[PDB]
Design a protein around this ligand. Structure first.
Ligand code: HEC
Ligand SMILES: [Ca+2]
Ligand SMILES: [Fe+3]
Length: 106
């Protein structure tokens, strides 16, 4: 529901994907990461809570989720075709995009 909830949904299911035994389990966690990322996209981070919603930082925030969802969708294609290792490495690519948004706005 709130930005913290979604942030932990991303964090949790990253672990699920790391520990998964097949690609369908990976696809499961990713689908939950997809929904958590779009929810997060709608929130206003406390760091930016004093900024215009039309401000360059507010669009940067939202566009980081666009890029994160784009990674998830490309990991899903792999996951849906049974390549568990490829899809798990796909998800590991996400981490640098997590961290990059954190540096600015966490
Ligand atoms: C901005 C475009 C983000 C991206 C992409 C990701 N995260 Fe994030 N995260 C972001 C903010 C602005 C915050 C602070 C929220 C607040 O209420 O102060 C966070 C915080 C987290 C946390 C822990 C903090 C908490 O409230 O529990 C975690 C565990 C976390 N974020 C995880 C995470 C992961 C794994 C991501 C990549 C899949 C990721 N985040 C992306 C902003 C953004
Ligand atoms: Ca793509
Ligand atoms: Fe990228």
């Amino acid at each position: 529901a709130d930005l913290e909830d979604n942030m932990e949904t991303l964090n949790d299911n990253l672990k699920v994907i790391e520990k998964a035994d097949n690609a369908a389990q990976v696809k499961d966690a990713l689908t939950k990461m997809r929904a958590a990322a779009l929810d997060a996209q709608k929130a206003t981070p406390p760091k930016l809570e004093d900024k215009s919603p039309d401000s360059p930082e507010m669009w940067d925030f939202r566009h980081g989720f666009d890029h994160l969802v784009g990674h998830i969708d490309d990991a899903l294609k792999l996951a849906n075709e049974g390549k568990v290792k490829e899809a798990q490495a796909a998800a590991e690519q996400l981490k640098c995009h997590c961290n990059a948004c954190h540096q600015k706005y966490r």
